Scaffold this active site. Sequence first.
Site, mmCIF file in Angstrom:
data_model
loop_
_atom_site.group_PDB
_atom_site.id
_atom_site.type_symbol
_atom_site.label_atom_id
_atom_site.label_comp_id
_atom_site.label_asym_id
_atom_site.label_seq_id
_atom_site.Cartn_x
_atom_site.Cartn_y
_atom_site.Cartn_z
ATOM 1 C CD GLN A 172 -2.874 1.024 2.389
ATOM 2 O OE1 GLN A 172 -2.890 0.660 3.177
ATOM 3 N NE2 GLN A 172 -3.911 1.923 2.299
ATOM 4 C CG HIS A 176 -1.544 4.204 -2.227
ATOM 5 N ND1 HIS A 176 -2.599 4.914 -1.745
ATOM 6 C CD2 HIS A 176 -1.770 2.958 -2.375
ATOM 7 C CE1 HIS A 176 -3.613 3.997 -1.867
ATOM 8 N NE2 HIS A 176 -3.071 2.845 -2.281
ATOM 9 C CG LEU A 353 -2.522 -5.412 -11.866
ATOM 10 C CD1 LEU A 353 -1.606 -6.227 -11.246
ATOM 11 C CD2 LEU A 353 -2.412 -5.692 -13.362
ATOM 12 C CE1 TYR A 354 0.931 -3.825 -5.869
ATOM 13 C CE2 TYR A 354 1.638 -3.531 -7.937
ATOM 14 C CZ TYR A 354 1.932 -3.865 -6.597
ATOM 15 O OH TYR A 354 3.240 -4.323 -6.350
ATOM 16 C CG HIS A 357 -9.712 -4.326 -1.922
ATOM 17 N ND1 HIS A 357 -9.151 -3.096 -2.282
ATOM 18 C CD2 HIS A 357 -10.206 -4.475 -3.174
ATOM 19 C CE1 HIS A 357 -9.437 -2.538 -3.488
ATOM 20 N NE2 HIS A 357 -10.220 -3.509 -3.862
ATOM 21 N N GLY A 495 1.163 -8.163 -14.082
ATOM 22 C CA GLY A 495 1.650 -7.455 -13.436
ATOM 23 C C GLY A 495 3.171 -7.217 -13.212
ATOM 24 C CB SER A 499 6.012 -4.632 -11.506
ATOM 25 O OG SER A 499 7.010 -4.510 -10.330
HETATM 26 C C1 COH Z 1 -1.640 -3.729 -1.591
HETATM 27 C C2 COH Z 1 -2.393 -3.200 -2.082
HETATM 28 C C3 COH Z 1 -3.543 -2.117 -1.245
HETATM 29 C C4 COH Z 1 -3.588 -2.486 -0.089
HETATM 30 C C5 COH Z 1 -2.943 -3.248 1.215
HETATM 31 C C6 COH Z 1 -4.659 -1.463 0.443
HETATM 32 C C7 COH Z 1 -5.308 -1.410 1.973
HETATM 33 C C8 COH Z 1 -6.392 -0.629 2.056
HETATM 34 C C9 COH Z 1 -6.920 -0.121 3.311
HETATM 35 C C10 COH Z 1 -6.164 -0.474 4.695
HETATM 36 C C11 COH Z 1 -6.506 -0.438 5.879
HETATM 37 C C12 COH Z 1 -7.981 0.783 3.137
HETATM 38 C C13 COH Z 1 -8.797 1.496 4.588
HETATM 39 C C14 COH Z 1 -8.163 1.047 1.866
HETATM 40 C C15 COH Z 1 -9.199 1.634 1.403
HETATM 41 C C16 COH Z 1 -9.316 2.298 -0.092
HETATM 42 N N1 COH Z 1 -8.704 1.828 -1.069
HETATM 43 CO CO1 COH Z 1 -6.793 0.192 -0.796
HETATM 44 N N2 COH Z 1 -5.434 -0.733 -0.638
HETATM 45 C C17 COH Z 1 -4.478 -1.264 -1.621
HETATM 46 C C18 COH Z 1 -4.498 -1.044 -2.850
HETATM 47 C C19 COH Z 1 -5.226 -0.047 -3.504
HETATM 48 C C20 COH Z 1 -4.904 0.785 -4.763
HETATM 49 C C21 COH Z 1 -3.853 0.514 -5.882
HETATM 50 C C22 COH Z 1 -6.161 1.737 -4.983
HETATM 51 C C23 COH Z 1 -6.614 2.922 -6.160
HETATM 52 C C24 COH Z 1 -5.455 3.556 -6.166
HETATM 53 C C25 COH Z 1 -5.694 5.138 -6.939
HETATM 54 O O1 COH Z 1 -6.193 5.536 -7.751
HETATM 55 O O2 COH Z 1 -5.516 6.060 -5.799
HETATM 56 C C26 COH Z 1 -6.974 1.639 -3.659
HETATM 57 C C27 COH Z 1 -8.134 2.424 -3.591
HETATM 58 C C28 COH Z 1 -8.604 2.468 -2.334
HETATM 59 C C29 COH Z 1 -9.536 3.580 -2.074
HETATM 60 C C30 COH Z 1 -10.234 4.421 -2.873
HETATM 61 C C31 COH Z 1 -11.150 3.897 -3.777
HETATM 62 C C32 COH Z 1 -10.762 3.866 -5.199
HETATM 63 O O3 COH Z 1 -9.544 4.321 -5.550
HETATM 64 O O4 COH Z 1 -11.485 3.308 -6.154
HETATM 65 C C33 COH Z 1 -10.183 3.447 -0.485
HETATM 66 C C34 COH Z 1 -11.146 4.130 0.273
HETATM 67 N N3 COH Z 1 -6.482 0.588 -2.996
HETATM 68 N N4 COH Z 1 -7.347 0.200 1.095
HETATM 69 O O1 LIG Z 2 6.378 -8.260 -9.493
HETATM 70 C C1 LIG Z 2 5.359 -9.024 -9.919
HETATM 71 O O2 LIG Z 2 5.184 -10.037 -9.980
HETATM 72 C C2 LIG Z 2 3.906 -8.249 -9.436
HETATM 73 C C3 LIG Z 2 2.892 -9.078 -9.971
HETATM 74 C C4 LIG Z 2 1.664 -8.327 -9.838
HETATM 75 C C5 LIG Z 2 1.367 -7.140 -9.166
HETATM 76 C C6 LIG Z 2 2.553 -6.445 -8.936
HETATM 77 C C7 LIG Z 2 3.801 -6.964 -8.840
HETATM 78 O O3 LIG Z 2 5.029 -6.352 -8.465
#
Ligand code: COH
Ligand SMILES: O=C(O)c1ccccc1O
Lengths: 553, 552
Positions: A172, A176, A353-354, A357, A495, A499
Amino acid sequence: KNPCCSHPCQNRGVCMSVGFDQYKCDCTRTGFYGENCSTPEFLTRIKLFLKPTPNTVHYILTHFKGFWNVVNNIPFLRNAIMSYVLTSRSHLIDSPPTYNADYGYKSWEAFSNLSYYTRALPPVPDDCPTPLGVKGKKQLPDSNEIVEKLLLRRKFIPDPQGSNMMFAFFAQHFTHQFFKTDHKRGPAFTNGLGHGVDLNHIYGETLARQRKLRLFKDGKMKYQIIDGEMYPPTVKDTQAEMIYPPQVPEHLRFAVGQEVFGLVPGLMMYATIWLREHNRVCDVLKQEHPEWGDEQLFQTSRLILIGETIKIVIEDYVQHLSGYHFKLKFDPELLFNKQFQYQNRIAAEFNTLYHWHPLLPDTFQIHDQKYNYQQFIYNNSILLEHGITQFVESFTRQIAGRVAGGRNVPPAVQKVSQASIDQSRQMKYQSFNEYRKRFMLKPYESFEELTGEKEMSAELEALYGDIDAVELYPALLVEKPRPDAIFGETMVEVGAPFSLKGLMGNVICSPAYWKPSTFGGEVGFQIINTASIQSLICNNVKGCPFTSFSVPD
Amino acid sequence: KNPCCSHPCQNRGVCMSVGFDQYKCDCTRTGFYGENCSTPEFLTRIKLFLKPTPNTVHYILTHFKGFWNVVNNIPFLRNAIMSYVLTSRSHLIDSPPTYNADYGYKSWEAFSNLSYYTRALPPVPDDCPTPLGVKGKKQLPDSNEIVEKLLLRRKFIPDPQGSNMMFAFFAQHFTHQFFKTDHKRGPAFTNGLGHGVDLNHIYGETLARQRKLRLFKDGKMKYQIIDGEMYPPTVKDTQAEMIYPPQVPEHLRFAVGQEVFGLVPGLMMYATIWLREHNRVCDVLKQEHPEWGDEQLFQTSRLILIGETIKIVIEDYVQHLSGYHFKLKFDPELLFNKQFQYQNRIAAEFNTLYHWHPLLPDTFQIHDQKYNYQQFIYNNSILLEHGITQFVESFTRQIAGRVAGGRNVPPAVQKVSQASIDQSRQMKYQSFNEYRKRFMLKPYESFEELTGEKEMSAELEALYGDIDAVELYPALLVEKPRPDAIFGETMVEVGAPFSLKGLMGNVICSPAYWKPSTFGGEVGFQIINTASIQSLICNNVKGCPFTSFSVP
Ligand code: COH
Ligand SMILES: O=C(O)c1ccccc1O
Ligand SMILES: *[C@@H]1O[C@H](CO)[C@@H](O[C@@H]2O[C@H](CO)[C@@H](O[C@H]3O[C@H](CO)[C@@H](O[C@H]4O[C@H](CO)[C@@H](O)[C@H](O)[C@@H]4O)[C@H](O)[C@@H]3O)[C@H](O)[C@H]2NC(C)=O)[C@H](O)[C@H]1NC(C)=O
Ligand code: COH
Ligand SMILES: *[C@@H]1O[C@H](CO)[C@@H](O[C@@H]2O[C@H](CO)[C@@H](O[C@H]3O[C@H](CO)[C@@H](O)[C@H](O)[C@@H]3O)[C@H](O)[C@H]2NC(C)=O)[C@H](O)[C@H]1NC(C)=O
Ligand SMILES: CCCCCCCCO[C@@H]1O[C@H](CO)[C@@H](O)[C@H](O)[C@H]1O
Ligand SMILES: *[C@@H]1O[C@H](CO)[C@@H](O)[C@H](O)[C@H]1NC(C)=O
Ligand SMILES: *[C@@H]1O[C@H](CO)[C@@H](O)[C@H](O)[C@H]1NC(C)=O
Ligand SMILES: *[C@@H]1O[C@H](CO)[C@@H](O)[C@H](O)[C@H]1NC(C)=O
Ligand SMILES: O=C(O)c1ccccc1O
């Protein structure tokens, strides 16, 4: 109406309308000819026959450990293999970039406007028989029903690969800096104009914000000292705006490069560690260069930290998720004899794809305490109560959720998951099978082939009707995982190109930059090439706690 | 006090301060080693000893007419030769870019901030013995004194290569899409954020300006018909602002992509011509694609025009300029099996060397009339009076001034020339000799060697004292011309890498873009690949007057 609606051009050939009733495929340099670029020229027949399937290659990379232990220890072999990995992967990315949400044809607007995510596949033309082109029903299924029936978690499904919360929050926090969707103008747009690893989530996207966060002494970034330990400064002290609900008291309103990193203490944990690391490198360089001023100390530290980041992503992070017995290497020199473009543009599909959740746990365990989402969110006092050491020790030991395999998205983030579907529709994404083709994969022939199972596949059928109608995001999350793996095939094969291209495409990996003097000399250069997730924590976290992206055995 | 003030690191090594009194050279990939990166490797001193001087290479390309004349007609050999010309030149350009006026060390700010011109050589550090670092007098000579003694025209010197007014205005019109100095900010900054041939001087730098200039029918750009001929629209109509003095009436304030092209009728001539070409291409694309909308028609026309521009600049413009018997070729495919970066950042030094004011005549001759500068400036009225056809016929036949050899700058633009020197000093440019070395040229050992002459070389020594203290801009203009040439060697050997890199590095020259579907099919593709300065005029100028970059 539009004849290119059927996506008739195969193997990355380009479709073009020729009048109202006809199209033409441009097969230039595809390796194929014929009216649909589907006839392999002789040399392609050779490559195709010899090209081993991704599941075959995955097997080889994930078995024969003794063999890999040998390869890992003869640099010539390790260099040669890492090289082919880099070049064959990034070869799947268009660079300079091409399409975006508003252009399914090449245009200067699409090329030059950095406010857009780029697109790996052009949008579906606006007036087609079906939303994805010509396949599927006239209307796509209710996104809510998709989330409830296929995506929502019933029982927590732990990641078989053992990914922990250090991994989840790193993912995350890291991504971001280049997934910064500008929802004020639409999902097609980004606020990250550097379009890569520029560490704007530490230093700020604009110069104005960077100046608010900098100390302007010794190259360092502002901080406060709580309990003898270093934390980010306040919004009050920096005037750097952050997203915080009103009820958050101002002494807990930490100010960091990314406006939203106060949302989760897991994010603020990493912001705090990286902030410490910056000011640590400042101290190292100042000792090495007592003649240097604050500006040079700042810029050099930044370049070094960018290098640390890239190093750690490849050799710890990508290494972990891959499951490879082969040891990945960060080494810019691998490409100096190769054709390679040092530039990148963040693709919207890479963002989609990233959306991992399912990684998220039902509760967050720190020390002997459990927090639900209501309690964890925007709660920096949790970070202060336990401290970073305890945070690392706990997060290292808490397991994350499996991403592929379906039905593991926490209900707490239901609408987020639905938004991913809805926004991809706004941006007129093509189908999952079209994206598999775009990355040299065989399209799935049935719902059961995709899931490897009879239950969820049946639900997909009742919703989509045709396998060629399943959308990118849901299909990634319900795809059959690889054996005891966090991901299915498509996630990795789509991915990794995005990446690796983004990482090695970084300007510091270019010949003009990749030299000791760029990083303040030999000591600065060394900081990069010896960096790891363990060293990052050991250097900046009291007690040098053990850490890893996987739970200990 | 800065140890790097002496520019100790040779062969593009990187200087770094190690302590208050010591430096270290980073010799990485220089092909050299030693404290100052002075000692060659085996491989390199071999490549060194057998690489011929550019003056020798120039002679070969400018002689043996009969030999080159058959080479030009065997596609294989022409391709091989052109391929090397491209690769050798471009390799001298750091890409991705490095330094700018504010950073003499590599930094993310320098790399990422597009509002800067990039710098082929880092700025002289602030705290230094001399303005240029270590060499020269404590204070540089008076800039106006340099202009008057060495640069001002005492008597018009015609270009021996025969360059005409069509050439001079093409040069100014084409380069002013990427030389757009943000003077309100400083000479170190540019308004051309696209940093190359994007034709923003036609379509506007921003989307907002583009939408003011577009017609939104058939992909066309707005225009007005005057006396049965197509001309740019007005400010009143487009609301796209232009720089005009209050003396110009509303109906004569033409609006084009670049805000300053109202300044010179020669610029407005090319603006008009390129405007017509855009709409001409829309018409062609519409016949090919009746199904297309306004937006696709516009964007595809733009891409095609970018192609036409690069084509025309290489095979006509740089061709005339070069004086080569060999026919240069525009062909992106020549780089597809080479390592090359399809990106570029405009160098401040590229801007400075392009200050070719001596090209300008004493007066401007349109038909029977002659106009001094005061009459010619901002005069759209005389563009309408004569028309484009007359403008082209006249400009084709009026000789331009020689750029090298000194003392050929029109007094009318005296303070512009002085400003060129002052801005160089403000941006802390290194010396001319440092820039010679930077582009693999032997530095000059004396003033006399620089001019091949006694009088100006004497003044230079009186002003500068040390040959290593001569500044880049004045040296380029007083440098010994190549025989019967418009330029001396330094203008060419420095300018050509900047120029070719920025041409071939354009995104449309990349594998993903260089294909017929990008330009709407083969018919669009062919417009690019058969474009020339004569065809651009024949297609868009009433009567199809003959035209060239040299006088008949
Ligand atoms: C490994 C990836 C990962 C994790 C661990 C994570 C962990 C968490 C987390 C942990 C407590 C919370 C409360 C949220 C909550 C949200 N995430 Co993520 N998110 C993740 C990847 C993403 C990505 C990538 C986006 C959209 C990126 C953008 O365009 O800003 C996203 C979007 C969101 C949004 C906005 C909706 C949207 O852009 O469509 C919220 C709210 N979420 N997420
Ligand atoms: O490195 C990868 O293999 C990969 C695959 C999916 C999403 C993010 C990533 O870094
Ligand atoms: C990258 O692409 C983005 C998406 O296309 C661009 O964002 C868009 O930018 C446009 C133009 O700036 C903006 O539209 C503007 O519309 C109005 C006119 O069309 C404008 O107000 C005008 O009012 C009068 C005419 O209507 C005129 O007299 C006055 O001077 C104004 O010009 C209004 O202010 C508005 O800003 C879009 O809102 C915007 N869209 C999005 C989704 O952001 C962006 O500019 C592109 N970037 C670059 C560098 O080109
Ligand atoms: C390449 C040939 C060329 C020609 C033919 C030409 C012809 C003419 C011409 C009449 C035809 C006039 C009236 C001028 C007058 C000017 N030129 Co030129 N210029 C040329 C190359 C340049 C360049 C390059 C710049 C700086 C561009 C920038 O930074 O915007 C320039 C800058 C200027 C400036 C800005 C002053 C400053 O502060 O630098 C003025 C005024 N001039 N020039
Ligand atoms: C590229 O570098 C430019 C030079 O550093 C930079 O311009 C500078 O931008 C800052 C914005 O923070 C301006 O700072 C001042 O702006 C106003 C007016 O004075 C004040 O409210 C601020 O507090 C601050 O004093 C500088 O004036 C400005 N300098 C110049 C010469 O233009 C650009 O912003 C950089 N570009 C990007 C994209 O970061
Ligand atoms: C337009 C003429 C320049 C006016 C400024 C005078 C500065 C000195 O100009 C003198 O002019 C002579 C003319 O042949 C030269 O021979 C001298 O070398 C030069 O120094
Ligand atoms: C935030 O965490 C603290 C403990 O660190 C707790 O007392 C407080 O109630 C939490 N805020 C909530 C649950 O809103
Ligand atoms: C390197 O350059 C310095 C510049 O001051 C000079 O004094 C010194 O002799 C040179 N040393 C070598 C080994 O070339
Ligand atoms: C342009 O035309 C003539 C030049 O001979 C002059 O009388 C007139 O004033 C000029 N007008 C402008 C606006 O410069
Ligand atoms: O093309 C060249 O050789 C050249 C030389 C100097 C300046 C600009 C140029 O295009």
